[PDB]
Design a protein around this ligand. Structure first.
Ligand SMILES: O=C(O)CCc1ccc(O)cc1
Length: 280
């Protein structure tokens, strides 16, 4: 987990061990950020976009920054073409897709691709929808923009990116309006967890099966949370932090699919929301 928000933007980089339950402190971000996404290419942990909320400013980020796990050092990579706060990212065969996000009052539908060994960015097909707080996930080498906020409406729609065809295709919408949901793939179906619908923070969770183009609910999380971090470790889903309408959780819940149950597995070292997350 990289970055996050609690009273201001965070530089924290911490790792959770689901075996012994403890948390490992690691090298701070060069620049604090909330509303960023995390991802892994070549075993390297990347932190994309976001925003530095502090008592001195609120600047959206175009930064891309790389952390080496054996080296514990951050390096500047090329910036995106535009700042993207509340971004979604997905990895397709070692490439970085930066999706949506905001810059001030501007709500991006644009998408951009980064080449890790070549350190370059280029724009591609824009989404059909302007999406802030978009969940992004890759399933069967296909990219999914899920949920989010267009500036007026929070979204239950979802659209799919075809790399080779470089086109966006709307798909079946979710049952539930979700902005700032945690979105990932677990088993072989896209999971969208929690989020915010313009009125409430959500605990419901729903999964999309490609072969039936259908969304189905599963067990809700224990705690309603938007701006949660999401990733998949040892065949299970992990939700981290987020906001519930009253407090910034350190609560971490773990979904068991076999039973279809969630359980709180740890507390973060400090309550927070809006982190970037990836796994090694
Ligand atoms: O729709 C929202 O306004 C944008 C995304 C967003 C959702 C929840 C949250 O706590 C922070 C950000």
């Amino acid at each position: 987990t990289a970055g996050g928000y609690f009273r201001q933007s965070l530089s924290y980089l911490e790792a959770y061990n689901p075996s012994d339950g403890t948390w490992l402190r690691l090298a701070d971000l060069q620049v604090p950020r909330s509303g960023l996404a995390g991802c892994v290419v070549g075993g390297l942990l990347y932190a994309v976009g976001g925003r530095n909320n502090s008592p001195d400013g609120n600047t959206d980020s175009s930064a891309l920054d790389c952390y080496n796990p054996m080296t514990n050092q951050w390096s500047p990579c090329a910036p995106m073409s535009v700042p993207r706060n509340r971004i979604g990212v997905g990895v397709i065969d070692g490439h970085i897709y930066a999706v949506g996000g905001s810059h001030g009052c501007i709500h991006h539908n644009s998408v951009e691709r980064y080449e890790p060994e070549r350190d370059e960015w280029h724009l591609v097909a824009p989404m059909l929808t302007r999406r802030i707080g978009v969940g992004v996930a890759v399933l069967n080498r296909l990219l999914y923009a899920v949920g989010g906020f267009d500036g007026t409406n929070r979204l239950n729609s979802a659209e799919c990116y075809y790399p080779e065809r470089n086109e966006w295709r709307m798909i079946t919408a979710m049952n539930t309006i979700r902005s700032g949901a945690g979105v990932c793939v677990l088993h072989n179906c896209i999971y969208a967890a929690g989020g915010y619908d313009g009125q409430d923070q959500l605990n419901s969770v729903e999964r999309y099966d490609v072969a039936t183009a259908t969304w189905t609910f599963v067990a809700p999380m224990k705690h309603r949370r938007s701006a949660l971090g999401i990733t998949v470790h040892q065949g299970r889903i992990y939700v981290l932090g987020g906001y519930d309408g009253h407090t910034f959780l350190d609560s971490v819940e773990c979904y068991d699919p076999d039973t279809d149950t969630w359980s709180e597995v740890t507390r973060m070292t400090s309550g927070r929301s809006g982190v970037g997350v990836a796994v090694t």
